[PDB]
């Protein structure tokens, strides 16, 4: 139900990997001693690799692995390293500056700064798993770093159109978010030597929880008032991307259509835009769309022996999923 | 005179920001712009004016206001909100060879090697007294960079800025058209020298 | 002697890969379109791949292949890309506006576009290099990429530090611009399938003709005209980065050691450095360092069998070295 | 009195843009300014002055020049070059518990959280009627962030900024002193409210 009280069954090991990022990146350099304090917030409680350290540990056990492998952890480093390069950067690109509350690196740092540390980090996970020497979780990896690059086409591409269905929206939302936790969950579950079967039901487990996720701050996006989030409320909808609560909407709306196709041409016509959505009932629908991601996340575990590892992994997607009430 | 002479002048004052209509405009602007071309088109001074073609409409014609958008899903696949600003819009009518000349200019930031146009000539015919018929002939982007940018959405780009169909023109002064195309468009075009083009 | 003349031997390779490259840098988005031209000024006659292909044809020859393989390719352009990449990542990163000459991506297109661009091939690299399945030579490639992180960190560190040494010299150098020849003739090398003594002495071969490369260049940041450069005679020291040339200047002159000690606080104190760098024959012992370097290399190839295509290595040795006379 | 007065307000015009000589001067500025404090310290008012401390040395006062510099590979080992701003100097002299404190503060120029300082206890002593021999306690870089940054190199950064050694008051106005320490180094300090620091 709360963020420390899921993140507490591998507080150690998020500890652990928060001092290794903290050293490693800001590399007794100045500047990037400062930016790596504050990229990694002390302590290391963060989702995804908590994620990575739970199905470790799951599955570990599962298999009889008594401790935690040198893979594990240089897996949920990477993991880290990855989701923290790709904000940075994405921060850089698009202009941002802010991230849920608090201010960006680009924003601290400059420009320069926050696309070196990001460079670094990609470096570093870069080579990191190149040394896990597991051909597998290196092409998983890859393919997370490839579908950031498609993510970036596909949603410079998708701006604006009302035509974008639901599985092509699914598909950025996976580009986005999905992917990285889909991988580090089957490559958590490759480095504990578990079944094939184990590692895809591990891969669908971080998909669709990811899914869920994505879908779930879709939402947050309309539904959380202007100053709870650090933007107006609907913004990834002025600003052409439209996400599920509009595709729902527009599903059987005509008049969001030729809002949104004059590109929010009237004045006003966001927030006419904005009543449509929470009238058509595609917030509602949005909703029972995370809520499926997340029951296909929670069947996904039903392989893992009871534990308080898999009991943390499925109370990752009750608190998503009440999240949004 | 100056009702229309200072209503012209009005006409060009509500249309300052709005970037010649072609990325959208409130609809409540858009009505005031249409009341102030009905009211021009209403004060024609030129009447039967495709026995005056030479004289009145030829020439070289910038434009100024046009319902022609270029919105939402179009605008991004041609990179039109971010990366390539939609330059002049020119029509020589040039009334010798039955002529019409679309030249859509195009610009890039700091690209000195994107700055291109989309051409399209066209040659028109007299079927009534105030009004052409507009026939497509050639098309062509340059420099090639522009094209390699465009070329893809090429069709999609031209049918934006057909000139093909009719052009029924209504007030026709010396120095300012308005145009009616097939397509119910309003086209305000100015007069511009030749070397703008 | 001329770098057509090296070229045209590998042009054909080239133009595939220059085409392939603007194929898929530029995925339909109107602005990278453009910057994928403007990036592969078009032929695709540029030292690296030209590399790659070369000891690509060589090795394969030495071994029957009777082509380059798929690998060979993926490998000309993973390198091409990483090169690329890093040398926009670097103009974004301490703010350039030139690079030889030509204008930057960053100038042209802006930083989030030039972010983009260099994430974009770094991502199709990082993908293309998993789908080789060769565990060596992507770790070869990520100690490259490793090494452009090293190589930031350690400039930064060794900023008007009077008492680098050449050996540390030497490996900024490396993590420069050798480490990624080096690599990438190792790997063309290791895909042809020759034994690991080639493929050691193509390393070799490699990281040497990248060390003479940039200890030439290191010289013409001096010998050259502040025209003949987009930049001053002299810009590598103005700049607080103290190359071979000044190394070996301060060897001897104590007074170029206050002058960069005070940063250059004199006003015509870079002059007077310049001065005392051409007078120190420090710009000599720097040639002869080339020098070298470039015979290391050229006996690196004596393992290849008689061509045209260890001709074309042997010649990009001396192509370098009489580019200072 | 204006002699040594519009001198003083000379040397001030001189250090305009230099940053209290931190990092470094052109040569013939240097040799200008030290004429300026050699013809202040000439003209000083304040002689036989550690018996006068209370009333002419007691105080907070900021540094506006010395021949501390940081320059080359520390300026680049401190991040002083492009990320950490040095701000002001302050030397507060307090005779009754007979203390000498250094506060350096500091800046990152966007890090509301790093916008710390290094503090330097020292403890005085008078030896010779224009001499007072330095001793250091206590040294402290706050925030623990800004400590994060300078640590693996504290020990240069106090070295920098340490008063330990004497400290010879050559001039010394009621908004202006000069002191020569032992390592031949200028300081040039000026009053400011202990509010400031
Ligand atoms: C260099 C290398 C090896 C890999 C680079 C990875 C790559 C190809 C691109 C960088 C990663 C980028 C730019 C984006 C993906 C990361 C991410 C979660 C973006 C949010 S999408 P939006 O911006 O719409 O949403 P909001 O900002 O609100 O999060
Ligand atoms: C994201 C990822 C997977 C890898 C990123 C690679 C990485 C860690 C950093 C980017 C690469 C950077 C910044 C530099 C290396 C490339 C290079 C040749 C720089 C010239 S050094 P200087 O600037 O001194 O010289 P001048 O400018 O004159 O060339
Ligand atoms: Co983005
Ligand atoms: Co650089």
Same mark, same amino acid.
């Given at each position: 139900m709360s963020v420390s009280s899921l993140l507490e069954v591998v507080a150690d090991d998020l500890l652990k990997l928060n001092n290794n990022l903290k050293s490693l990146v800001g590399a007794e350099n100045?500047?990037?001693?400062?930016?790596?304090?504050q990229i990694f917030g002390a302590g290391g409680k963060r989702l995804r690799p908590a994620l990575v350290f739970l199905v470790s540990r799951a599955t570990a056990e599962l298999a009889g692995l008594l401790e935690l492998t040198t893979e594990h952890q240089r897996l949920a480093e990477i993991i880290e390293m990855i989701?923290?390069?790709?904000? =940075?950067?994405?921060?850089?690109?698009?202009?941002?500056?802010?991230?849920?509350? %608090?201010?960006?690196?680009?924003?601290? *740092?400059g420009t320069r700064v926050a696309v070196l540390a990001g460079d670094?980090?990609?470096? #570093? $996970?870069?080579?990191?798993?190149?040394?896990?020497? @597991?051909?597998?979780?290196?092409?998983?990896?890859? #393919?997370?770093?490839?579908?950031?690059? +498609?993510?970036?086409? %596909?949603?410079?591409?998708?701006?604006?159109?009302?035509?974008?269905?639901?599985?092509? &929206?699914?598909?950025? +939302? &996976? *580009?986005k978010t999905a992917s990285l936790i889909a991988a580090s969950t089957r490559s958590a579950a490759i480095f504990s030597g578990v079944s094939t079967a184990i590692c895809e039901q591990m891969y669908e487990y971080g998909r669709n929880l990811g899914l869920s996720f994505q879908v779930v701050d879709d939402i947050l996006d309309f539904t959380q008032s202007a100053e709870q989030l650090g933007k107006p409320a609907g913004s990834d909808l002025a600003k052409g991307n439209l996400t599920a609560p509009?595709?729902?909407?527009? #599903?059987?709306?005509?008049?969001? !259509?030729? =809002?949104?196709? +004059?590109?929010?041409? /009237?004045?006003?016509?966001?927030?006419?835009?904005?009543?449509?959505?929470?009238r058509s009932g595609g917030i509602k629908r949005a909703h029972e769309l995370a809520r499926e991601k997340g029951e296909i996340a929670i069947q996904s575990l039903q392989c893992l022996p009871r534990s308080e590892f898999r009991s943390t992994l499925e109370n990752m997607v009750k608190y998503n999923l009440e999240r949004i009430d | 005179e100056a009702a229309l002479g200072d209503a012209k002048d009005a006409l060009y004052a509500a249309?300052?920001?709005? @970037? !010649?209509?072609?990325?959208?405009?409130? $609809?409540?602007? !858009?009505?005031?712009?249409?009341?102030?071309?009905?009211?021009?088109?209403?004060? @024609?001074?030129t009447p039967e004016p495709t026995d005056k073609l030479q004289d009145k409409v030829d020439g070289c014609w910038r434009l100024v206001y046009?319902?022609? $958008?270029?919105?939402? %899903?179009?605008?991004?696949?041609?990179?039109? !909100?971010?990366?390539?600003?939609?330059?002049?819009?020119? #029509?020589?009518?040039?009334?010798?060879?039955?002529k019409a000349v679309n030249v859509i200019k195009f610009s890039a930031r700091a690209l000195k090697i994107l700055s291109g146009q989309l051409t399209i000539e066209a040659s028109y015919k007299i079927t009534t007294k105030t009004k052409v018929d507009i026939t497509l002939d050639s098309s062509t982007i340059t420099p090639d960079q522009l094209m390699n940018i465009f070329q893809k959405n090429y069709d999609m780009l031209?049918?934006?800025?057909?000139?093909?169909?009719?052009?029924?023109?209504? &007030?026709?002064? /010396? +120095?300012?058209?308005?145009?009616?195309?097939?397509?119910?468009?309003?086209?305000?075009? /100015?007069?511009?020298?030749? $070397?703008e083009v």
């Amino acid at each position: 139900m709360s963020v420390s009280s899921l993140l507490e069954v591998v507080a150690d090991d998020l500890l652990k990997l928060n001092n290794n990022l903290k050293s490693l990146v800001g590399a007794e350099n100045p500047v990037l001693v400062s930016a790596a304090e504050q990229i990694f917030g002390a302590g290391g409680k963060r989702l995804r690799p908590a994620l990575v350290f739970l199905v470790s540990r799951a599955t570990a056990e599962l298999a009889g692995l008594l401790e935690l492998t040198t893979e594990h952890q240089r897996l949920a480093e990477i993991i880290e390293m990855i989701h923290t390069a790709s904000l =940075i950067h994405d921060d850089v690109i698009d202009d941002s500056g802010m991230r849920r509350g %608090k201010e960006t690196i680009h924003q601290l *740092y400059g420009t320069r700064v926050a696309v070196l540390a990001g460079d670094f980090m990609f470096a #570093q $996970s870069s080579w990191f798993l190149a040394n896990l020497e @597991n051909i597998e979780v290196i092409k998983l990896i890859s #393919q997370v770093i490839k579908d950031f690059a +498609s993510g970036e086409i %596909k949603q410079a591409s998708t701006l604006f159109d009302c035509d974008i269905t639901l599985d092509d &929206y699914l598909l950025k +939302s &996976y *580009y986005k978010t999905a992917s990285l936790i889909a991988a580090s969950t089957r490559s958590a579950a490759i480095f504990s030597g578990v079944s094939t079967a184990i590692c895809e039901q591990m891969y669908e487990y971080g998909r669709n929880l990811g899914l869920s996720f994505q879908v779930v701050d879709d939402i947050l996006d309309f539904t959380q008032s202007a100053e709870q989030l650090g933007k107006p409320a609907g913004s990834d909808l002025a600003k052409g991307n439209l996400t599920a609560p509009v595709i729902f909407a527009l #599903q059987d709306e005509p008049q969001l !259509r030729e =809002i949104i196709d +004059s590109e929010f041409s /009237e004045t006003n016509s966001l927030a006419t835009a904005i009543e449509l959505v929470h009238r058509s009932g595609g917030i509602k629908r949005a909703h029972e769309l995370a809520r499926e991601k997340g029951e296909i996340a929670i069947q996904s575990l039903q392989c893992l022996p009871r534990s308080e590892f898999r009991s943390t992994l499925e109370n990752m997607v009750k608190y998503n999923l009440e999240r949004i009430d | 005179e100056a009702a229309l002479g200072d209503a012209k002048d009005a006409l060009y004052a509500a249309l300052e920001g709005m @970037n !010649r209509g072609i990325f959208g405009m409130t $609809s409540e602007k !858009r009505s005031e712009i249409h009341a102030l071309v009905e009211l021009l088109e209403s004060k @024609n001074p030129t009447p039967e004016p495709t026995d005056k073609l030479q004289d009145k409409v030829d020439g070289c014609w910038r434009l100024v206001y046009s319902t022609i $958008s270029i919105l939402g %899903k179009k605008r991004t696949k041609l990179g039109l !909100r971010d990366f390539i600003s939609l330059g002049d819009f020119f #029509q020589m009518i040039d009334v010798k060879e039955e002529k019409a000349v679309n030249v859509i200019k195009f610009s890039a930031r700091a690209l000195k090697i994107l700055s291109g146009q989309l051409t399209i000539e066209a040659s028109y015919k007299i079927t009534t007294k105030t009004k052409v018929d507009i026939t497509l002939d050639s098309s062509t982007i340059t420099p090639d960079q522009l094209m390699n940018i465009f070329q893809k959405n090429y069709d999609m780009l031209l049918a934006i800025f057909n000139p093909e169909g009719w052009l029924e023109i209504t &007030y026709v002064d /010396e +120095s300012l058209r308005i145009g009616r195309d097939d397509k119910a468009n309003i086209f305000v075009l /100015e007069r511009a020298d030749p $070397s703008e083009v």
